[PDB]
């Protein structure tokens, strides 16, 4: 992108006063053509002779995937039941957890969706004709409900 | 996350972490997410991809 | 309350089969976007003729 302080012939020209395709496109609408042929003025050349000074903008996109941080000493997984989950299974202890997130500003109201991955297991036993039974274990975020 | 907030802290009360696995997280938008505890959401006025 | 059965199911399908094969009976057809809309690449136009 064009430098706004290190390019000395920089001018902030807004959408209204931009032209490029003059006389061959409508004025700020998908309506019919308007105007006369004229030299453009909108993008500044960043290539060829008389390329204007510029700085890099760098970003990425990443869609359809949640960020994830494994809960193990090495972030690689050597099994379903981690090695730091077994700290508290060979000697249980309760701890608090605070997570502080820093996110970009956004004009619209937003939510944070945090997934705390557990073991959610149902063990279904049918011991007799026309009878089904089940026991639901859920580990560091046990079910407080047991609703009808 | 309030509009134009750049921080959301989480505090989880002190409880066991027996058999805990990872975490994941992602950001959504309030207008696009209905609640599943409710049978109807009167404030949910979006019909796009959830 | 704090279980997301619907989301969980989408993920399960992905780890098993491919999601690019559409099915009609159970209505599989993963949501998509064209990668030339989401990330626009300008390679100009051929205006040399």
């Amino acid at each position: 992108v064009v430098d706004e302080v290190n390019y000395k012939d920089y001018q902030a020209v807004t959408l209204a006063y931009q032209h490029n395709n003059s006389g061959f496109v409508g004025y700020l609408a998908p309506t019919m053509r308007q105007g006369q042929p004229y030299p453009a003025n909108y993008p500044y050349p960043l290539i060829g002779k008389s390329a204007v000074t510029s700085v890099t903008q760098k970003k990425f996109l990443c869609d359809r995937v949640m960020w994830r941080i494994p809960f193990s000493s090495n972030f690689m997984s050597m099994g379903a039941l981690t090695d730091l989950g077994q700290n508290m299974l060979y000697a249980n202890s309760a701890h608090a957890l605070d997570m502080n997130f820093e996110v970009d500003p956004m004009d619209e109201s937003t939510l944070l969706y945090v997934v705390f991955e557990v073991f959610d297991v149902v063990r279904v036993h049918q011991p007799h004709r026309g009878v089904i039974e089940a026991v639901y274990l859920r580990t560091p975020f046990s079910a407080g409900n047991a609703t009808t | 996350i309030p509009a134009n907030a750049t921080n959301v802290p989480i505090s989880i009360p002190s409880r066991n972490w027996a058999a805990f696995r990872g975490w994941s997280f992602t950001r959504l938008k309030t207008k696009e997410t209905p609640s599943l505890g409710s049978g109807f959401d009167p404030y949910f006025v979006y019909s796009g991809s959830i | 309350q704090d279980r997301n059965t619907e989301l969980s199911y989408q993920l399960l399908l992905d780890s098993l089969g491919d999601r690019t094969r559409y099915f009609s009976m159970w209505n599989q057809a993963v949501d998509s976007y064209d990668p030339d809309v989401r990330i626009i690449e300008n390679h100009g136009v051929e205006d040399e003729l």
Partner: peptide, 17 residues
Amino acid sequence: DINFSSLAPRHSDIGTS
């Protein structure tokens, strides 16, 4: 995490019953 699977095949035609 996202992943977690632990259900997969580990696999007179009978012994005793």
